[PDB]
Amino acid sequence: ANPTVIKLQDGNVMPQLGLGVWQASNEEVITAIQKALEVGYRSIDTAAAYKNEEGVGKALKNASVNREELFITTKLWNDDHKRPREALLDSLKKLQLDYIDLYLMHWPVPAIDHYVEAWKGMIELQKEGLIKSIGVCNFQIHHLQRLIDETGVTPVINQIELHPLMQQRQLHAWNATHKIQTESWSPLAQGGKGVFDQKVIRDLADKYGKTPAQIVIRWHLDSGLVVIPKSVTPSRIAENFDVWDFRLDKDELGEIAKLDQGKRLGPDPDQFGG
Q: What is the annotated signal peptide range for this record?
């Protein structure tokens, strides 16, 4: 089978599986992306706060894949909410791109409460064609309503922490109802601790001849989620992409559903930045 794509509410199309690039050094970043593009990834996710957009930009030039075939995502950092134009141009410059495929607000930072300002600015940069699609990361239902109520413009993506231990059934449901595509970061529950070692996952891994990480990524896919596993290890970047030759059954998905503990492993959307 071919890697699937998802059509966003604004009509733009996005690969359902992409590579997340975080903290890492330029060395790790350039090598990771070269490996991912080589194996088939067409979606690369980075952030201005990680300080490696330049490395990401250099890897894209070096690559043979054409720009138009690449779906690049970057994000607006917390202390730039009042100046999205300045932040975006700085990103586009470092990435060596004329436009970004998806621009996401990294965090709402409700304590500062400038996320509405950021969104209005993003709405304007999108009109000028510098951004194809706009969305957010780590936005809770009330943050989303506030954006909708104040601008009439709904995000096409809400990138949130979601894995077998915190399935976010509620936010996922709410996103979908409002035509917002849910995207998972930390899809492997940072390491797999409390997941890969579960009987349901292990048996699935053995039935399909896949690694537990491959089972979990397939789970995100069959759940209709866009997923961004993060990795800078060549063999794992490849492993995580080898999930197109099988699908989990309704019953198998139901079995994984029992793992939900509502356990958040990363920063708290309602407190981070405050």
A: none
